Amino acid sequence: RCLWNNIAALPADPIFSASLVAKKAPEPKADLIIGAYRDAEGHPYPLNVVRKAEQRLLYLPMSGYAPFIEESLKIAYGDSVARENVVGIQGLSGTGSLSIGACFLARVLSRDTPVYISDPTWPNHYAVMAAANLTDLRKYRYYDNAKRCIDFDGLLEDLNGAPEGSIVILHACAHNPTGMDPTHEQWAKILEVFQARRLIPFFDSAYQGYATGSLDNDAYSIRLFARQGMEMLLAQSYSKNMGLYAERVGVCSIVTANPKKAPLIKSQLETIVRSQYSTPPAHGARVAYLVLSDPELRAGWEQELRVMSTRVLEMRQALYDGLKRLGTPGSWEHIIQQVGMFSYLGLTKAQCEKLIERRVFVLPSGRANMAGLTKRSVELLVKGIDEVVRTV
Amino acid sequence: CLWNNIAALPADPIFSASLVAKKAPEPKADLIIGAYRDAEGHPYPLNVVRKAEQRLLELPMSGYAPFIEESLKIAYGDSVARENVVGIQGLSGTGSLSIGACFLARVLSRDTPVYISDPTWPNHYAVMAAANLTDLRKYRYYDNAKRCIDFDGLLEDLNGAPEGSIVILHACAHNPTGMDPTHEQWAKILEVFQARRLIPFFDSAYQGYATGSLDNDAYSIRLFARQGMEMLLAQSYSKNMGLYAERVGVCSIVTANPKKAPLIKSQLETIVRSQYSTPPAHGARVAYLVLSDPELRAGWEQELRVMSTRVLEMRQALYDGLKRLGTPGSWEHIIQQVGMFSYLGLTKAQCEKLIERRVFVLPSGRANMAGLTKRSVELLVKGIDEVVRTVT
Ligand SMILES: *Cc1c(COP(=O)(O)O)cnc(C)c1O
Ligand SMILES: *Cc1c(COP(=O)(O)O)cnc(C)c1O
Numbered sequence: 001r002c003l004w005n006n007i008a009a010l011p012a013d014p015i016f017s018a019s020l021v022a023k024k025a026p027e028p029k030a031d032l033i034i035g036a037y038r039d040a041e042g043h044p045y046p047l048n049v050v051r052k053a054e055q056r057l058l059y060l061p062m063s064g065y066a067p068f069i070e071e072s073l074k075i076a077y078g079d080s081v082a083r084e085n086v087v088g089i090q091g092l093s094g095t096g097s098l099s100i101g102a103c104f105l106a107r108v109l110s111r112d113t114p115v116y117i118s119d120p121t122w123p124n125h126y127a128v129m130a131a132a133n134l135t136d137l138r139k140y141r142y143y144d145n146a147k148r149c150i151d152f153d154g155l156l157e158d159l160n161g162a163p164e165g166s167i168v169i170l171h172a173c174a175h176n177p178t179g180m181d182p183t184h185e186q187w188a189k190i191l192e193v194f195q196a197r198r199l200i201p202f203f204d205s206a207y208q209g210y211a212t213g214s215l216d217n218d219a220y221s222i223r224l225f226a227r228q229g230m231e232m233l234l235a236q237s238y239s240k241n242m243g244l245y246a247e248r249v250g251v252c253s254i255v256t257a258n259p260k261k262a263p264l265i266k267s268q269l270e271t272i273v274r275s276q277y278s279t280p281p282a283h284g285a286r287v288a289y290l291v292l293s294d295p296e297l298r299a300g301w302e303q304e305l306r307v308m309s310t311r312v313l314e315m316r317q318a319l320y321d322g323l324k325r326l327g328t329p330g331s332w333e334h335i336i337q338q339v340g341m342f343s344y345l346g347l348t349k350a351q352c353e354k355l356i357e358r359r360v361f362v363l364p365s366g367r368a369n370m371a372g373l374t375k376r377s378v379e380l381l382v383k384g385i386d387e388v389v390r391t392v
Numbered sequence: 393c394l395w396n397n398i399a400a401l402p403a404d405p406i407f408s409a410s411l412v413a414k415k416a417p418e419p420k421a422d423l424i425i426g427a428y429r430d431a432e433g434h435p436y437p438l439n440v441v442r443k444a445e446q447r448l449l450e451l452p453m454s455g456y457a458p459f460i461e462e463s464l465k466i467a468y469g470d471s472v473a474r475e476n477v478v479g480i481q482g483l484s485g486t487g488s489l490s491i492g493a494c495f496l497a498r499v500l501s502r503d504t505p506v507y508i509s510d511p512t513w514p515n516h517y518a519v520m521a522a523a524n525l526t527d528l529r530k531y532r533y534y535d536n537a538k539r540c541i542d543f544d545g546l547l548e549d550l551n552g553a554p555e556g557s558i559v560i561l562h563a564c565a566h567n568p569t570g571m572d573p574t575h576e577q578w579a580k581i582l583e584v585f586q587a588r589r590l591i592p593f594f595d596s597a598y599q600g601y602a603t604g605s606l607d608n609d610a611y612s613i614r615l616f617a618r619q620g621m622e623m624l625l626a627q628s629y630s631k632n633m634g635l636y637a638e639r640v641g642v643c644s645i646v647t648a649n650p651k652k653a654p655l656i657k658s659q660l661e662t663i664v665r666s667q668y669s670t671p672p673a674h675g676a677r678v679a680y681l682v683l684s685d686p687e688l689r690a691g692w693e694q695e696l697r698v699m700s701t702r703v704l705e706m707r708q709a710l711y712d713g714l715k716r717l718g719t720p721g722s723w724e725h726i727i728q729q730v731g732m733f734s735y736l737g738l739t740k741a742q743c744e745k746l747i748e749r750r751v752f753v754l755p756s757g758r759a760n761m762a763g764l765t766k767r768s769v770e771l772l773v774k775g776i777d778e779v780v781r782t783v784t
Pocket of ligand 1: 204239
């Protein structure tokens with residue numbers, strides 16, 4: 001007898017292997033899997049202001065460190081709704097905050113509630129929903145691989161098919177892995193569907209401040225839905241926009257249309273966090289609270305974020321410029337319409353396989369970490385893409 | 393309003409009371425938190441951990457393999473061959489427990505009955521429910537009025553369990569009562585497991601705390617594993633190393649068929665992705681140094697021995713004091729109990745009256761015994777003698 005005889009084969013981790021290849025590859029190379037950042041997830045090192053806050057930092061309820069929760073709600077919702085319509089609790093980073101929200105949705109609605117997920121998405125979305133036992137997982141078309149844009153007609157078709165009450169996982173800004181976000185107009189069309197079909201937004205905000213370098217503008221989609229009266233969930237991470245991965249800083253929040261339901265939501269969320277931590281991680285919350293609340297730290301963080309987003313846009317611009325100059329076949333407009341640190345380069349699996357023999361390392365999906373590119377590496381990437389497009 | 397029928401829940405039974413204890417005037421005995429960091433009883437790092445942190449200054453998805461190996465070694469020793477064990481990192485005890493719960497939910501069924509001791513560490517229910525184990529059941533464990541393990545009711549409830557039921561076992565230092573099965577009792581418990589094909593899911597948060605001997609505290613884990621039975625184990629280092637801030641834990645699965653280990657491992661790795669996007673390396677490295685380095689290991693073991701001796705001495709002082717006063721009732725449970733927490737044996741009304749003498753215990757008679765001192769134990773002796781003789 002063996003309890004586990006049916007455990008079921010799973011495909012192996014694509015990224016981990018390929019990541020080691022790029023790392024333990026010679027030296028004359030362009031690593032766009034990990035590179036300058038710390039993992040293939042793209043966690044950066046603590047930002048300058050975060051380090052200042054760590055230094056300057058020299059009895060919690062289960063929901064966690066309330067000053068941090070309040071600042072986290074502020075940066076996300078920005079007065080789009082009244083405070084009494086908002087409930088927040090600490091999560092262990094983005095992943096923990098997603099799982100809190102997913103377990104909350106599973107407990108208060110139903111584990112059989114359909115969840116729509118973008119095609120493609122951040123891969124561990126599936127792992128989070130499965131751990132919550134959200135078993136009815138569906139795709140909405142998102143990236144159009146042929147036209148190198150958001151398949152917005154497909155997206156709207158799939159969401160217009162969503163059963164009422166379906167959960168939709170939404171990337172707040174800097175869609176991962178494509179780097180391509182809806183326009184404001186597209187968000188308006190999306191919102192109309194949510195409203196007509198009474199779908200449940202579940203916003204994933206891991207990059208507020210990365211997309212445009214503007215916290216407010218990056219929050220457009222969250223605030224559009226909240227302000228127009230949508231009830232919804234939000235998972236916030238600070239692992240990327242502050243570099244606080246090790247301290248596991250995040251918030252899961254719920255928007256209620258009825259403020260009298262808020263204490264009930266809060267208690268339900270508090271028993272859920274108990275499945276995640278026995279004591280709220282106070283230290284990372286105190287650090288983030290200080291970056292958020294202190295005017296001088298807050299100003300320096302907003303500025304470093306603005307610096308990063310213009311830099312990455314610059315590199316994208318150089319990439320596109322190099323591809324136009326070489327006459328590389330295809331549309332390359334998507335390269336300068338993308339934001340955040342990941343971009344879908346627009347290549348086929350086969351073209352990506354050949355790039356990795358140039359020691360230009362991207363994922364086989366065409367995902368490139370575009371932060372960390374230098375004028376030298378972007379020109380290697382120009383020549384590499386131009387070669388594989390023409391010969392593969 | 394989606395959140396209209398959210399079930400009302402009871403208030404946190406510790407948080408408010410712990411505040412009353414911390415805010416009360418200085419001549420007092422705080423047996424809720426005291427000198428420990430929080431209400432769960434997480435200590436500051438032991439000295440060997442501090443020394444490990446210092447020496448450290450001189451992946452894949454499952455985590456830091458040498459940590460996992462030493463963690464399994466200390467738990468299982470000679471009771472099971474290495475090829476029958478699969479282990480992954482979890483975020484402390486809670487995370488490790490969640491991984492195991494989600495694994496069982498995934499590979500067996502979410503409807504699989506889960507038996508949980510009455511009383512238990514409260515967050516067990518929240519871990520199991522977040523994994524969406526929906527059939528949670530009590531087994532009788534402690535009879536508060538009799539001040540002993542209700543061993544006839546315990547065995548009765550497990551004999552009533554359906555075959556394949558999951559049972560959450562406290563490996564040692566049962567929380568919150570402090571009362572563990574004897575070795576003979578553990579074997580009578582194992583008999584029911586063996587006869588009824590029950591699935592042990594051990595929770596080991598106090599290995600080395602209970603008795604100061606890592607090997608002796610693993611008795612029950614090793615009694616069951618040396619049978620060849622399949623089981624799960626969640627290990628925390630938050631309490632016996634004081635490493636809560638580093639979220640160090642291990643979930644292991646025992647498989648009777650080594651060939652299934654690769655599949656088990658892949659399943660676990662999918663599951664940890666609901667919990668963290670990159671494993672908590674630093675605490676694994678710290679723990680690994682404590683576990684494997686001859687000097688640090690030996691010093692860690694000495695600190696554990698001293699800690700357990702110290703708390704036994706405080707229990708013995710309390711018992712001796714109540715005996716000298718002739719306080720009514722049986723007080724043997726005081727010196728039979730182990731670990732940081734004790735059920736002192738008081739009624740709710742006796743506990744309420746102790747609070748007016750500023751001796752703060754939970755109304756469930758639970759006291760953190762480990763922060764007691766010669767000074768404070770003498771106040772507890774007199775408070776207990778008082779409320780026993782004068783209430784109800
Ligand atoms: C990074 C990321 C997460 C998870 O955040 P972590 O903090 O690393 O746990 C979730 N969703 C998306 C879209 C991300 O990019
Ligand atoms: C303390 C405790 C835990 C949780 O471990 P953490 O490291 O704090 O998450 C789990 N189970 C039991 C029985 C405990 O006493």
